[PDB]
Amino acid sequence: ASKLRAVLEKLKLSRDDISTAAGMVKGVVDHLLLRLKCDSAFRGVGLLVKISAPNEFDVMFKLEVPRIQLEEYSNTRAYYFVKFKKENPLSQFLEGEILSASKMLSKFRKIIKEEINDIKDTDVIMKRKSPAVTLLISEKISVDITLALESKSSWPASTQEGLRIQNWLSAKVRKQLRLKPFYLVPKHAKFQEETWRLSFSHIEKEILNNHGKSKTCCENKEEKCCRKDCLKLMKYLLEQLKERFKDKKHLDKFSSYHVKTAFFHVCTQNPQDSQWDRKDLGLCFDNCVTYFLQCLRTEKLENYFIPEFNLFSSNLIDKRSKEFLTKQIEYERNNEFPVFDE
Ligand SMILES: [Zn+2]
């Protein structure tokens, strides 16, 4: 538990170190952003992870899309086709009544390829593989560019029982959050079609930076909880294990989003700030680790917003993999986390 504090001190090294990198990234983003704003398809475009990879950045480009009509993809409660109900500037991407993910991405990558290949004053390169574009700025400054539509409709029905923050952040807060927009990113489910996936990364960001039962948690010396610290330690636990077990790729399917999702559920389970006292760091981390093991072992990790979307289903992550991680995390917990030693 003082070992855990030692780990957190080791991780805290961003202060002004990243501030130059960010400047590099912010410089290339805004130029890109204002070129897209030229295009008819990209009028409403504007801005909207790995705790130990300070040169890798993640940016989402949001695009306002009214009149929107969702159609669920074959009862996979998180993936949808996009339809409409005048004529939108996005009507150039229709493939039938369905909005084409692939076709909007090609134009998007085409236009970005223009602004990088035509402006090589400060050099840039663009690699490609939902994240449609990755850019290399100079030596290993990478930034991931994601396209998302913004919808201001009510959230889809699949989220009705999600975001179970009532006893933690209040029913009032749930109500306000759900009046905010939701987002859709092009991604296909496991087969290829023009399907989109729900994204709530902005709500996630908001509850994390306003995370207490108390409105003044994080704002005075008397109300310092260890919530963010437990999330960081959980993300580091996974990154270290993925790195150490990399020779055989047992853990390639697991990601920080799985650990962030489990963390939010423990917040729901543990709603009082007194359950996250800093003097109980060791115990709060163990509650996080213990719930993650339960997810692994039961093979159930509900998306925090979409409770019938199981991140740990066998269609996404096979059984052997989840059993292998279970065993390694069990070993770490039962030995006071040797992976954190110096
Ligand atoms: Zn706090």
Side-chain angles (χ1 to χ4, degrees):
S2 42
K3 189 206 289 199
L4 297 181
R5 290 187 271 263
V7 173
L8 279 169
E9 297 301 288
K10 181 168 154 295
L11 297 168
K12 277 177 194 179
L13 242 99
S14 295
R15 283 172 200 180
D16 287 328
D17 184 282
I18 70 97
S19 244
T20 98
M24 324 296 299
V25 182
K26 246 323 169 63
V28 181
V29 164
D30 288 357
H31 156 58
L32 292 171
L33 191 84
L34 66 82
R35 170 67 163 88
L36 310 169
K37 282 171 190 168
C38 268
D39 203 299
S40 52
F42 299 147
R43 302 283 157 81
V45 62
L47 276 79
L48 180 45
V49 177
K50 266 184 70 177
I51 223 77
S52 66
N55 300 62
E56 312 184 14
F57 294 103
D58 232 303
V59 188
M60 272 191 39
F61 287 7
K62 67 163 179 285
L63 190 46
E64 155 77 291
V65 174
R67 256 184 177 197
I68 210 182
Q69 186 88 71
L70 288 198
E71 180 199 305
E72 180 171 357
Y73 180 65
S74 137
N75 280 33
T76 87
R77 309 237 70 206
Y79 289 99
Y80 293 86
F81 296 108
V82 178
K83 303 187 159 218
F84 297 91
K85 300 180 264 183
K86 212 171 191 171
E87 199 77 321
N88 42 317
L90 269 49
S91 49
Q92 47 180 312
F93 297 120
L94 305 171
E95 269 194 358
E97 293 151 358
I98 275 92
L99 178 59
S100 181
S102 38
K103 298 331 163 78
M104 213 176 185
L105 290 170
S106 62
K107 176 169 177 136
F108 185 65
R109 298 191 208 88
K110 201 275 264 60
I111 300 181
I112 281 137
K113 183 150 70 173
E114 266 162 81
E115 313 312 297
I116 266 47
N117 263 320
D118 283 308
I119 301 198
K120 245 105 82 70
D121 297 318
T122 94
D123 70 324
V124 268
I125 7 271
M126 105 133 167
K127 183 193 231 62
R128 172 233 260 263
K129 200 188 308 169
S130 174
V133 174
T134 312
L135 294 162
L136 192 84
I137 296 168
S138 75
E139 288 150 281
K140 286 305 170 64
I141 288 223
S142 74
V143 30
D144 260 55
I145 286 94
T146 302
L147 197 53
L149 334 160
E150 183 181 73
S151 170
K152 294 191 177 95
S153 319
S154 287
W155 296 9
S158 62
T159 71
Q160 206 90 82
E161 310 304 310
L163 192 56
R164 298 202 317 147
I165 62 177
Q166 291 91 341
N167 291 325
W168 167 28
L169 305 161
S170 75
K172 268 190 272 261
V173 167
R174 194 183 184 268
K175 240 185 225 66
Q176 331 160 355
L177 292 172
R178 292 178 56 91
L179 293 177
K180 291 176 188 290
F182 68 92
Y183 295 87
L184 300 126
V185 307
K187 209 189 308 172
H188 42 65
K190 299 191 170 179
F191 308 97
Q192 199 159 49
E193 266 141 326
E194 311 309 332
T195 58
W196 307 68
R197 179 175 157 170
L198 299 171
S199 160
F200 299 100
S201 72
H202 60 299
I203 309 291
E204 292 164 23
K205 162 185 157 68
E206 184 165 340
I207 60 193
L208 281 167
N209 294 345
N210 196 357
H211 55 251
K213 175 158 297 300
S214 171
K215 278 156 197 174
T216 43
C217 186
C218 91
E219 285 193 5
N220 56 89
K221 50 167 179 304
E222 279 80 47
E223 306 184 73
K224 292 302 192 166
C225 80
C226 68
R227 281 188 179 89
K228 277 185 178 174
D229 284 347
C230 287
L231 175 55
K232 281 177 182 71
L233 292 166
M234 283 292 299
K235 289 183 194 190
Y236 197 61
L237 174 55
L238 184 61
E239 292 177 6
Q240 292 305 282
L241 286 171
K242 292 179 75 198
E243 179 65 18
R244 292 187 173 198
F245 283 99
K246 76 173 173 140
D247 294 294
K248 276 180 181 178
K249 313 171 163 203
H250 295 111
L251 305 179
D252 285 15
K253 295 274 187 178
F254 299 103
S255 69
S256 65
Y257 194 63
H258 298 134
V259 114
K260 183 184 201 193
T261 303
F263 165 86
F264 281 141
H265 288 287
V266 185
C267 283
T268 289
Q269 292 176 35
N270 284 287
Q272 302 289 331
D273 297 334
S274 62
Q275 289 173 294
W276 300 94
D277 192 307
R278 277 217 194 286
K279 306 178 284 291
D280 297 336
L281 177 58
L283 178 67
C284 303
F285 187 55
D286 177 55
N287 296 345
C288 292
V289 168
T290 292
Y291 181 71
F292 198 67
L293 272 177
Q294 173 187 292
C295 296
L296 289 173
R297 211 185 303 268
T298 66
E299 302 187 69
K300 195 174 184 291
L301 180 54
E302 292 184 348
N303 177 294
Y304 196 61
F305 302 80
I306 304 174
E308 298 170 286
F309 177 27
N310 181 4
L311 308 184
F312 279 177
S313 76
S314 48
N315 169 47
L316 298 180
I317 297 181
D318 64 284
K319 217 180 185 51
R320 314 173 176 156
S321 289
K322 286 166 293 200
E323 292 163 338
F324 190 78
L325 187 50
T326 290
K327 164 168 183 307
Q328 313 307 330
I329 286 170
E330 222 172 0
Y331 169 85
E332 294 300 311
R333 170 168 192 261
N334 293 338
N335 292 96
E336 296 249 276
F337 303 96
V339 72
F340 287 168
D341 293 350
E342 285 308 297

